[PDB]
Amino acid sequence: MNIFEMLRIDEGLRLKIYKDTEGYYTIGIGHLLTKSPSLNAAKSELDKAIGRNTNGVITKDEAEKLFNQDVDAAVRGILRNAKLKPVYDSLDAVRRAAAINMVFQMGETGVAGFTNSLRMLQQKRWDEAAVNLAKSRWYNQTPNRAKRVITTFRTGTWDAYK
Ligand SMILES: Cc1cccc(CN=[N+]=[N-])c1
């Protein structure tokens, strides 16, 4: 297991435009296209991201290309965020993957309210962090995924992903 395999499990792979858990147009391995309710707008974003007229369909290779970009960009972002970098740097590689997973799903703005969880993670208070992480919209809306990510933070193992 690693961050790519972990997110592939959590996000799936679909080659046609679909709506994510929040109802937003998405393709590939959780590549968010836009929050616009306009399918035409999503198709434009897709064509821009891929560099050809896709008509809303891509290949597995193209999906994997966007995915690698999205994972890389999520990491680079964390490192650019003064609140997130110190916690990320304090973690082992397995828990870093859990961190990347959350930022991939919700963005840096999506984790702005996780200040108290972040402190507990920095303190390596793993069971307390795990309890705090679940007191969230995130957990309530996507509990099965959140349970996997939280177990990863709690244990520093890949047990939740087999
Ligand atoms: C950079 C980073 C470290 C640990 C967790 C998260 C996700 N949000 N929370 N808690 C981000």
Curated annotation (Swiss-Prot):
Record keyword Hydrolase present: yes
Major subcellular location class: host cell
Result of changing residue 11 to Q: Complete loss of activity
pH-dependent activity: Optimum pH is 7.3.
Any one GO molecular-function label of the UniProt entry: lysozyme activity
GO CC annotation: host cell cytoplasm
Record note on what altering residue 20 to C does: Nearly no effet on specific enzymatic activity
Annotated GO biological process: cell wall macromolecule catabolic process; defense response to bacterium; peptidoglycan catabolic process; viral release from host cell by cytolysis
InterPro entries assigned to the protein according to its UniProt record, in alphabetical order: Endolysin_T4_type (IPR034690), Glyco_hydro_24 (IPR002196), Lysozyme-like_dom_sf (IPR023346), Lysozyme_dom_sf (IPR023347), Phage_lysozyme-like (IPR052619), T4-type_lysozyme (IPR001165)
Transmembrane stretches, start-end: none
Name under which the protein is recorded: Endolysin
GN (gene name): E
